[PDB]
Every structure is written in structure tokens, then in C-alpha cells.
Design a protein around this nucleic acid. Structure first.
Ligand SMILES: [Mg+2]
Ligand SMILES: [Mg+2]
Ligand SMILES: [Mg+2]
Ligand SMILES: [Mg+2]
Ligand SMILES: [Mg+2]
Ligand SMILES: [Mg+2]
Ligand SMILES: [Mg+2]
Ligand SMILES: [Mg+2]
Ligand SMILES: [Mg+2]
Lengths: 240, 392, 45, 238
RNA sequence: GCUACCUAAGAACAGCUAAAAGAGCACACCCGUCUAUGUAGCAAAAUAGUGGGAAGAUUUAUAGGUAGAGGCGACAAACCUA
RNA sequence: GCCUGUUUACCAAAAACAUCACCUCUAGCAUCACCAGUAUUAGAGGCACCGCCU
RNA sequence: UUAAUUUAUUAAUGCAAACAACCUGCAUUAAAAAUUUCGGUUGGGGCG
């Protein structure tokens, strides 16, 4: 197929980008993921997941003003247009982020624990143990990848040496260098669980389509079965 | 995270043939064949020179080599720039103090009923109805059509006062005029390249509104600042620019003095339309730019407090909502935040009419709202007429 | 109900069976070569 | 330096008594290695005094390469053995950090693929009885299939009552005795039995006395004779 | 170029009732419940009446994509040029 | 059978399929699907809206 | 499908090979498959 990814834009921008739906299809044109197709046309707002991104020819901790908090069609979380210095960027909004609020993005690992105010980003080394966090990086400067969905919140479980133990929302422990940045608080749109789809049409609007033949293997779906050993073959299906 | 996936990035050229790595021998390529063959070496073609020269096949040089390129980056405000902080940002950029409401000097010009137009409300209602309903064979005219129409018809209605005011003969509304003004603000050099439209030029400069005492009183006022938003935000940071002050006209032009800048936000789509605050900011910046170009043309290119302040008006409208501005530039010493400050009187969100019903709404076969404007406000047209009559 | 499976459109015809698409693959080139060998008046569509 | 190590151990929750105990425990182990090992152990969620007890019991852990120690700790965290879970594991079988990654992985893969145990069930089994890791493959599969097919037990019950902890010899000795006595019946194709079978706690958890008095209702002499007979039967079969 | 699903960018949806609805009645439009006709027929699946939906998980034009043990499938082994 | 929908083009429109709702299982993660997403997420399977008594 | 035959291919491991990644060869276990078959007598079928 003549499929070229829509994710071709190279320069970050605030303008929503026209994104092409896939239908669950590979670049080969064959269905790779079932149950995807249609839905409301959407525009993609490029999220800057690296909260500590000091502006060009600038460095050090910087503050930013929350211009607005907006619904994002491409996420469970709602996003925040936030402006600092002479630039604007989209970030993931925390639970109580409001328009006009101020946000701190620092790389400073203070000797003492920094007062953790919801919404600001500090290196994990600077946070008190037991603080709720989100938008957690795996490596310093990689960019947030974990705890990004609406209402999610990891816990800074431990800090020893230069390594911090985080409890991901799946209640799995993760080891990250304490120099990696995370933002304080739980992600916004905390009521995303309680939303009721109500009707099949709403899922169709969200772009989920009812799809069958999801396995493509001979015989379709087949649950795993325990293959009895030769000694145990005599007891597999004992008649009544 | 890097933007732009590999599959969309330009493909890496195929590796060079190993024959090119062997020093002593000349590879045999398909260059002589004048066409590709897969079993011969790929030629290394020298770059082609005569290409990016033809006018229809031209490549501009890199920005570094352009004549007006400058290492110091100017911040330009053009017609399609939307200030984040709006009026506050414009006030900081222009070193201006805001005053709510139009000045009494201009507001009094319409208090007496002699200046009131005969059949004023009837004519204004006809203008609104023509712009919004009767303009075209189409049932509902779009904003791109009814904003310029409403502005031009209101201007004609005001110009009809030439009977009472013969001084109105010494003015003309020019279109597509473009001005440019540069000035410094705390080592930041800002330019305004105002294009807009409908510059009302007069043969005589407008009288100053603020007295010497008020201009000096502006010293105490502190210029409001916003943090962490820099005042530069949403201004085009450009290294290619011209620091010349252009008033938009050749020397010797009759009607040299700007009187009113009519800015109209006629975009059909709300996202393409300025917010009211951003429109007021654009009005402030364009009035300041025209006033500054006039000041640099008259009293030379010297930063100083103006002995004779330059007054420029502006009306910024979306077709329904109007904003009126009188800007007094009384200082070309903009770099410092201290001293006498320019001052702008702004009247905001003066809506000519609340809503217009192009179709008669019918509920249960009963006409509820008749066709036409609802909530028409003659006061806004009074203010418009006052601004037009100022200086006459 | 059936029989009208052909809903003509010259864009689809040329894009599906045209000379350029035939030459775009080695298999289609062999299609054209077979038609030339047979002596077809119309090599492609 | 010893200064840095002492400051770190003053941090991390360790008291001076345990710090001195561990310093004495050092069998030519560099202070840097000891600090790294203790740091990894408390990263795994283990408290300072269980860390001290474990290092006392098995000083060999301090000899582990830090790369291997970190890899094993990450693997255990992925397997879910962490915080208070790792404590009883490091007591019952402290050699998990010394076992081969391949051995642990193949035990887990046998439990999941060839035995159809959920991830949570695998974590519960490892937490309850780490002797499964010591137990060789093949034998473990035979034990599980004995529970599943011949005994008619399901995964939730096999996990609830730590069937995999008990020895295969004991399991067969009791189950075959019950079956030949007729007090235990393999569930049919429908999964039903004429009489409800005794519970696995009543079969394996209890001692021989109550096992023969309440579940089997037979005599200890008869049970001993049956055990010897079953040993002969197994030897002849194999 | 049928059909199934998808992609891009379009278009259509009277009137009444109701009021922001996978709402009601009912045109266009889509479908195909029942009956009759037809059965080499007008038709290799139609006609007439009746009936279901008809602002939506709708219908639909255009261009593109997925290819045979493969595709596609709100699974009927349905559909992929009778 | 929860509902509106879908299906055997051409003998079956249904109680069948789907469906909101719920449950189970799997997955700690970047530059071609999932997804420019990150466990309130994604994928798969089951069941049947809902509500009550145990 | 607990019919027979395979595991070429993938996925895991192991051992060699190249000095961790990656890759080659040889094994073992799986997944996915592939190929192939359906003796005779007894109204038929079950159990024979
Ligand atoms: Mg068609
Ligand atoms: Mg309608
Ligand atoms: Mg309806
Ligand atoms: Mg369908
Ligand atoms: Mg079926
Ligand atoms: Mg139904
Ligand atoms: Mg229905
Ligand atoms: Mg049919
Ligand atoms: Mg039918």
C-alpha cells in the first residue's frame, strides 16, 4: 500500500495538527489491530512531555503561566496550554490546574526536600518520599512516558543513592535515576472512570468499531489448554 | 521525544559503490549512457549551477545572506499576530497608560443635537439591514461580506455631515496603506508593520487631548508587567527586517496626518477572528505605530518627549462589536520604563446591535422574533460619529 | 440485482490496468510482453 | 570511603548496632560493594533489620557481582517479589539471588505456559514456597498434572493450599491411599463426584495421625504397609 | 469500478411533534416483513401493495487501500466482478 | 431478546451477531499499526443493559 | 483431535562461533503450521 504516516511534522507547534485515522491498518494496508475505525475527526495537539525544557539560549528553573486547560480528543487527560518567556506549549494538566495558575519547572535537586506544590515539575530526587507524581520519565531527559492517563498517580516510594523507587499505577515498582523529572499531583480528568458510554453509538464516535475475526489463526481464538503427560492421559476425561 | 518519524523522514541515499573506495582506478558508471542501469556504478554528479536562477524556478538565498539580515533579532508585530496578554502586553510594548472610556473632548462633539444626523437611527438601521440581510441574493451574508460593508456605510453616513462641518472636506479614507515603525523597549527592538486597511487621513493633525499636566502625571503611573510571560510573546522574532520608519506614503502626499485607523476582523471563522482583547491590543499597536511613524517623520528620529503630542484614533470592529481608541503619543523615549508615558483612551465592546435575525423564527406556526436587528444601540454609533468628527 | 458489476470510471480504469501500472512491476511488464508476443492490438487498458 | 558508607548507612534506616554487625560480617568485602548490595536490597523494599538478618545468614550474597545483583533484583521486581514479599522468600530460600536466571525463568515459564497459572498466582506460589525454584522441571510438571488431572484440583485451589510445596512422594502416598480406600474419587468429565472429596488441607496439611483418623479412618499400621507397597510399586514402574 | 472492511476529502436528510435525543409520526433516501404477480420473467432476484429505518452504529458520490489458505467479516462459512 | 442497530446480495431478519454494563486474562512501553498513545491505558476472551436476594 | 510423520520457519533456552548487542552452526522444548490416511464381515448405529 501507499501508506505514509501522518506523524511527519518535524517542528513543534501549538496549532492542532490534522491526524489521519488508521482503521487498525499497518503500512501494508492489512488490519493489524481490530476494532478500530471511523469516529469523530480529530486534530492532534503536540504535547511537550519534557516539562523541564528551558527555552533557547536559556537555562535553569523557569516558571510558566497556565493560559488554559482544554479537553484533548487524543487523551484521557485534559491538556494545558502553558506559556513561559516567549513560547507556548501543551503539557498534561494535573487535577487542580486552573487557567492563570503558575507552574515551576526545575532541574535543581536541593539538599532539602522541595515543597511539593501540585502541577510543578522537579527531579525525583527533590521530592519528599510518598508524594504523588505523574508524567514520569524512565531516563533523565527522555521525556515523560509513565503515569499519563487521566486521574493516574504514582507514588515516590523510596529514594536511596541516586535511584528512586516509584510505584506505577499498576502497582508495579520501577527504578529511575533521581535526576529524572516528574510532576507533582495526579493527572486531571479524575472522573474518567465514571463516564458511562451509554450507547454503542458513543463508542463508534470514539472510533471503536465492532470487529470479529480478530485472530486470523486457523480455527480463530483458542484458549490455552494443558497437554496431559503420558502417565496422566488415563485420567483426562474419566466417564461418569 | 523527537518529532517526525523515520518512515516519513527522507530516505538515506544508498551506500556508495565500493569501487569508489579504491584509489587508483576510475569507476565505470552509467553517466556515459545518460540513463540509469542497475549493473553499472552510480555516478557522482557535480552540483548543477544554472538551476535556481530562473524566475519561475528560483531558490532564495539562505536568510543569513539577505541584505537586511541583522544579528540583533527584531520583534515584529504584523496584522496576523495575536498577543497572548492582549491589552496589557500592548500597553507595556507601547509604554502606554490606559483610560477607560473615550475622552470628554471627543464625546462632547455629539452631545448637541445639531451634529446628530437627521434620520440617524433610520439610516443606521438601513445600513445594518443591508449589510446583514439585504446585501446579496444569498439569505445569510457572511462576515467577510458584512463587516467591510457595515464599516464603509457607517463611514459614508458620518461623511454626510459635510453639510454642518465643511472641515470634513479635508480628509480622505485610503485603503491598503501600510506603515512601519521601529522603537526600542529595554534593549528589545520592536517593529510594527501595520497593513490593515481604511486609514482615514486628514490635511490637519488632530488636537491633543491630554494636557501637559496630565502627560506629566503619567510619570507616577507604573507600567503593569506580567510574569513569567515575556512582553515579546506572540511577536514574530525576525532577523530580516528594516529599521526605517515608513509612514506609508511618499513625501508631499496631501492628507499626511492619520486621523483614524479602521481595523476590521472580517474572518468568517471564530478561530481566524481575533478575540476582543487581542483586537484592542492590535488597535493599540497600530495606532502607536502610525503615531510613531508620524513623529519620526516630523520631529526627526530622536528619542525625546514630544512637545506636540501626536494623536491617532482607531476603530476596531468585527461587524457587530466595536472598539474605539484614541492614542496620544507624547514620547519617543520608549526604551526606559520611567518618565512620561503615552496614553490611550479605550471604549471596549460597544455593540452596535445585540443580534440580527436573518430568518423569522417560527414556533408553532407563530412568528416570535421578526426579521431584523435586535437590541440596536445608537450610543455606539454616537461614539463612532464623535470619533469621525474629532478634528472637524 | 446482479450483472451491473461494471461501474465505469476512466480514472480507475487507467490506474488499475493502464500502461504505467503495467510497467510499474516486473509481472505487469511480462503481461505486456505476453500481449506483444500474442500480437494483441491493445497491450494495456 | 568508610565515611561515605557510614553516612549512607546512618541514612537508609540502619542503626549503628546493625551497621557494626554488618561491618563485622564483611568477609573481605569492600565497603563500596557492601553499600551497593544493601542499597539494592532496600531498593527491593526490604527493611534494615531483615537486610541485616539475611546478610548474617548468607554472607555469600555480599560476594555477588553488582551487575548480577542488580539484574536479579530487577527480575524479582518484575516477578512481583518485593517489599514484604521478599522477606519470607529470603528466609525460606536465600539462594534465589544465587540461582541462575535461566533456572528461575524456566520455572516461571513452566508455571505459566505448561501449567496455565496467572501472573498473580505465580507470584503467590513463589512468595509462599520458593522451594519450587529448587525443585527441578519435569518433576514440577508431573506434580502439577497429578493435582490437575488425576486429583481433579484446579489452579485456585492448588495456589490456595500450597500443593506445590509438598513432596510428590507424600502427595501420592496420601492420594492413592484415599483413592484405593474409595474415600477420594477423581471428578468425572462433568467435574462431579458421587461423594464430595476431602479437602486438600484435610489431605496434606494435617499430620498422619489426623489424616488417618478423620479423612481415611484407617490404622497407622495399614498406612505403613501401604506406603511400603506404594514405594515398591513406584520402583518397579520406574 | 460488485461486495466486505478501512483511509482522505465531500454531500443529503421535507413537514409535524418534540427539544440538543443511536427520540415519535412520517417525505426524499436506505432497506426488504408479509402477500400476490412473475417463474426463458421487465428482471440470471423484478413488479404491485404492505411494511422497517429515516439527525444516525444513517445513507451516499469520488479517489485510494487490504488478494486467495490470503483478504474482509456487528460469525451468516457471509462477501472478495452473477 | 434489555433497548437503537447487524446478518445468510438471490428461499432464513430471528430467540442469532453486535451493543452499552460487568467480569477475566495479558502488557511498565517511544518514532510505520496499537500510538505520535502510557494501567482511569492498550490488546484479547467471556457474559449480558439495569435493579434486588443470597 | 490424546491419528501418523515432521519442525523447514518463528520463539525461547543450551552448547560452540564472532568478542554485551548482533550474527552463524548444532541441539532441545514449544507455538504455529504443513503433509497424509480412514481395512474387511454382520438392515444401519452404539457396544461388540
Ligand atoms: Mg459503486
Ligand atoms: Mg427532519
Ligand atoms: Mg430516530
Ligand atoms: Mg458489516
Ligand atoms: Mg454460527
Ligand atoms: Mg433485539
Ligand atoms: Mg430493530
Ligand atoms: Mg436470503
Ligand atoms: Mg427474507
Amino acid at each position: 500500500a501507499n501508506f505514509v504516516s501522518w506523524k511527519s511534522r518535524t517542528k513543534y507547534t501549538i496549532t492542532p495538527v490534522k491526524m489521519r485515522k488508521s482503521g487498525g491498518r499497518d503500512h501494508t494496508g492489512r488490519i493489524r489491530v481490530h476494532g478500530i475505525g471511523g469516529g469523530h475527526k480529530q486534530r492532534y495537539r503536540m504535547i511537550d512531555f519534557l516539562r523541564f525544557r528551558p527555552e533557547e539560549t536559556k537555562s535553569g528553573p523557569f516558571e510558566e503561566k497556565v493560559i488554559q486547560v482544554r479537553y484533548d480528543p487524543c487523551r484521557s487527560a485534559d491538556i494545558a496550554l502553558v506559556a513561559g518567556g516567549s513560547r507556548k506549549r501543551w503539557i498534561i494538566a494535573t487535577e487542580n490546574m486552573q487557567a492563570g495558575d503558575t507552574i515551576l519547572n526545575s532541574n535543581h535537586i536541593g539538599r532539602m526536600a522541595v515543597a511539593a506544590r501540585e502541577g510543578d515539575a522537579h527531579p525525583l530526587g527533590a521530592l519528599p518520599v510518598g508524594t504523588l507524581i505523574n508524567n514520569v520519565e524512565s531516563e533523565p531527559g527522555r521525556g515523560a512516558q509513565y503515569i499519563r492517563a487521566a486521574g493516574t498517580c504514582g507514588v515516590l516510594l523510596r529514594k536511596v543513592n541516586g535511584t528512586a523507587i516509584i510505584q506505577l499505577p499498576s502497582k508495579r515498582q520501577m527504578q529511575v535515576l533521581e535526576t529524572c523529572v516528574a510532576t507533582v499531583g495526579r493527572v486531571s480528568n479524575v472522573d474518567h472512570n465514571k463516564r458511562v458510554i451509554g450507547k454503542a453509538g458513543r463508542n463508534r464516535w470514539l472510533g471503536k468499531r465492532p470487529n470479529s475475526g480478530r485472530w486470523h489463526r486457523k480455527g480463530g481464538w483458542a484458549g490455552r489448554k494443558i497437554r496431559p503427560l503420558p502417565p496422566m492421559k488415563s485420567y483426562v476425561k474419566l466417564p461418569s | 521525544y523527537e518529532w517526525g518519524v523515520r518512515s516519513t523522514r527522507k530516505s538515506e541515499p544508498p551506500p556508495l559503490d565500493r569501487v569508489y573506495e579504491i584509489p587508483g582506478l576510475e569507476p565505470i558508471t552509467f553517466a556515459g549512457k545518460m540513463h540509469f542501469v542497475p549493473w553499472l556504478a552510480r555516478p557522482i554528479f557535480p552540483p548543477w549551477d544554472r538551476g535556481y536562477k530562473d524566475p519561475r524556478f528560483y531558490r532564495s538565498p539562505p536568510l543569513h545572506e539577505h541584505p537586511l539580515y541583522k544579528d540583533q533579532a527584531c520583534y515584529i508585530f504584523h496584522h496576523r499576530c495575536r498577543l497572548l496578554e492582549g491589552v496589557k502586553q500592548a500597553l507595556w510594548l507601547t509604554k502606554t497608560k490606559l483610560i477607560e472610556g473615550l475622552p470628554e473632548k471627543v464625546l462632547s462633539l455629539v452631545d448637541d443635537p445639531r451634529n446628530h444626523i437627521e434620520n440617524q437611527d433610520e439610516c443606521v438601521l438601513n445600513v445594518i439591514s443591508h449589510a446583514r440581510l439585504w446585501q446579496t441574493t444569498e439569505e445569510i451574508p457572511k462576515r467577510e461580506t458584512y463587516c467591510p460593508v457595515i464599516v464603509d456605510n457607517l463611514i459614508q453616513l458620518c461623511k454626510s455631515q459635510i453639510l454642518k462641518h465643511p472641515s470634513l472636506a479635508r480628509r480622505i479614507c485610503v485603503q491598503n496603506s501600510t506603515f512601519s515603525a521601529t522603537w526600542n523597549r529595554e534593549s528589545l527592538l520592536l517593529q510594527v508593520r501595520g497593513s490593515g486597511g481604511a486609514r482615514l487621513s486628514t490635511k490637519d493633525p488632530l488636537p491633543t487631548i491630554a494636557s501637559r499636566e496630565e502627560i506629566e502625571a503619567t510619570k507616577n503611573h507604573v507600567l503593569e508587567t506580567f510574569y513569567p510571560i515575556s512582553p515579546i510573546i506572540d511577536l514574530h522574532e525576525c532577523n530580516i527586517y528594516d529599521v526605517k520608519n515608513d509612514t506609508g506614503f511618499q513625501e508631499g502626499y496631501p492628507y499626511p496626518y492619520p486621523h483614524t485607523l479602521y481595523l476590521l476582523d472580517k474572518a468568517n471563522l471564530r478561530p481566524h477572528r481575533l478575540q476582543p482583547d487581542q483586537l484592542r491590543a492590535k488597535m493599540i499597536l497600530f495606532a502607536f505605530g502610525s503615531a510613531l511613524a508620524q513623529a519620526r517623520l516630523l520631529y526627526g528620529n530622536d528619542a525625546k518627549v514630544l512637545e506636540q503630542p501626536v494623536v491617532v484614533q482607531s476603530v476596531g470592529t468585527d461587524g457587530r462589536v466595536f472598539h474605539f481608541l484614541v492614542f496620544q503619543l507624547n514620547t519617543t523615549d520608549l526604551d526606559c520604563n520611567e518618565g512620561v508615558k503615552n496614553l490611550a483612551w479605550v471604549d471596549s465592546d460597544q455593540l452596535l446591535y445585540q443580534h440580527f435575525w436573518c430568518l423569522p423564527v417560527i414556533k408553532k406556526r407563530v412568528v416570535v422574533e421578526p426579521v431584523g436587528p435586535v437590541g440596536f444601540k445608537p450610543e455606539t454609533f454616537r461614539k463612532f460619529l464623535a470619533l469621525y468628527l474629532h478634528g472637524a | 440485482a446482479r450483472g451491473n458489476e461494471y461501474q465505469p470510471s476512466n480514472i480507475k480504469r487507467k490506474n488499475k490496468h493502464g500502461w504505467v501500472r503495467r510497467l510499474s512491476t516486473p509481472a505487469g511488464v511480462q503481461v505486456i510482453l505476453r500481449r506483444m508476443l500474442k500480437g494483441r492490438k491493445s497491450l494495456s487498458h | 570511603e568508610l565515611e561515605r558508607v557510614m553516612s549512607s548507612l546512618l541514612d537508609m534506616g540502619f542503626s549503628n548496632a546493625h551497621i557494626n554487625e554488618l561491618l563485622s560480617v564483611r568477609r573481605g568485602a569492600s565497603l563500596q560493594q557492601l553499600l551497593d548490595i544493601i542499597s539494592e536490597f532496600i531498593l527491593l523494599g526490604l527493611n534494615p533489620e531483615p537486610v541485616c538478618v539475611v546478610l548474617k545468614k548468607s554472607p555469600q550474597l555480599l560476594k555477588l557481582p553488582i551487575m548480577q545483583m542488580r539484574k536479579r533484583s530487577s527480575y524479582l521486581q518484575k516477578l512481583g517479589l518485593g517489599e514484604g514479599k521478599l522477606k519470607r522468600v529470603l528466609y525460606c530460600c536465600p539462594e534465589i539471588f544465587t540461582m541462575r536466571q535461566q533456572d528461575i525463568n524456566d520455572t516461571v515459564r513452566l508455571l505459566k505456559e505448561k501449567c496455565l497459572f496467572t501472573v498473580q498466582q505465580v507470584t503467590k506460589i513463589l512468595h509462599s514456597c520458593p522451594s519450587v525454584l529448587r525443585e527441578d522441571l519435569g518433576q514440577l510438571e508431573y506434580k502439577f498434572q497429578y493435582a490437575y488431572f488425576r486429583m481433579g484440583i484446579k489452579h485456585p485451589d492448588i495456589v490456595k493450599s500450597e500443593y506445590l510445596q509438598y513432596s510428590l512422594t507424600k502427595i501420592k502416598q496420601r492420594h492413592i491411599y484415599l483413592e484405593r480406600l474409595g474415600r477420594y474419587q477423581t471428578p468425572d468429565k462433568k467435574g462431579q463426584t458421587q461423594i464430595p472429596n476431602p479437602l486438600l488441607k484435610d489431605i496434606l496439611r494435617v499430620s498422619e495421625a489426623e489424616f488417618l483418623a478423620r479423612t481415611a479412618c484407617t490404622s497407622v499400621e495399614e498406612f505403613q504397609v501401604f506406603k511400603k507397597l506404594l514405594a515398591r510399586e513406584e520402583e518397579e514402574s520406574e
